[PDB]
Design a binder for these strands. Structure first.
Lengths: 62, 62
DNA sequence: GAAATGTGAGCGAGTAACAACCG
DNA sequence: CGGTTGTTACTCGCTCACATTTC
């Protein structure tokens, strides 16, 4: 099982690898068109957000 | 803070970040004195290995 | 000037490589 | 002769911070 990443989703959606990250946490300062693109791309690739790295970026709230 | 970073340990022990992991690796070119120095910070600071970080660092643990 | 997206760096830890250095 | 230490960054997978962009 290949661990999908936001890079896969963003590339497929046609956006920056960050755009997919903003929807998973808040989604402030984003256009609906960009958001739908992001969400549909993550479902098609069956990408699962890796929480290990999510908290790694400066959180660790578990 | 109990779960400190290896950088935190490296500093306390008075060594490099390279030798700090070496002690844990318990296989590299690690001198006896070196491990004693490092393990001191480990206990004093209570180094806790982050499964998420260790795995993200290139260790396919998940 | 502010929304929005892209560019970029940082986080945590592990590992890799050669060369100098003292024992 | 050689065991050993080191710097420094890469790299994961992510997310925030900022720079740019444009109206």
């Amino acid at each position: 099982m290949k661990p999908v990443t936001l890079y896969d989703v963003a590339e497929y959606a046609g956006v920056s690898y960050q755009t997919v990250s903003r929807v998973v946490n808040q989604a402030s300062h984003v256009s609906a068109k960009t958001r739908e693109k992001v969400e549909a791309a993550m479902a098609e690739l069956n990408y699962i957000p890796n929480r290990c790295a999510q908290q790694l970026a400066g959180k660790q709230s578990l």
